Symmetry: none
């Protein structure tokens, strides 16, 4: 019944999202860009796309029908990653204080 595990694996594999990449050969640890909106280096097409893609996939946001609320899209994916036991953040590897910020996640088998 779940969807997030296979969905996010597919997005990483797709190569459509520049910072979203595997960090080991085993495809069990990945990087996910995590840029604050409103900051000077924030590309709102490119840094919202994965979050928007999840809201589109799950039917929460419908292009042309619903009003975009990108911050809401981010909150959804963060909270889903937090609650899912298929994903656990490697907090000591995440880097949120630099110019290209990112989180690091491990996928539970």
């Amino acid at each position: 019944n779940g969807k997030l595990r296979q969905w996010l694996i597919d997005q990483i594999d797709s190569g459509k999202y520049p910072g979203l990449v595997w960090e080991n050969e085993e495809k069990s640890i990945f990087r996910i860009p995590w840029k604050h909106a409103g900051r000077q280096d924030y590309n709102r097409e490119e840094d919202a796309a994965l979050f928007k893609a999840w809201a589109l996939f799950k039917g929460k946001f419908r292009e042309g029908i619903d009003k975009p609320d990108p911050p809401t899209w981010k909150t959804r994916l963060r909270c889903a990653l937090n609650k899912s036991n298929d994903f656990e953040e490697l907090v000591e590897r995440s880097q949120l204080d630099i110019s290209d910020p990112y989180k690091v996640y491990r996928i539970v088998p």
Copy 2:
């Protein structure tokens, strides 16, 4: 079932603020439906109603079970959804107001 007559009694009783009839024929009613605060369920004006369903059905025994209001809410919500005796008038429900509530018609 048990829920149909029980909820009618609760509305008729006047014991729960906001649990009230909307028409003379006593077929449409409002049930307050507020999101809880941080372990603050008193802002829910009908929080008593969720506890009452759990007691009536023996699901909560005072002094034995841990109070679990969030769970009490889900039981009544899910019971209403599946029940063929209560049917939500979604076009009348008001979840976005300061004293929010849902509206239900009772099926004959």
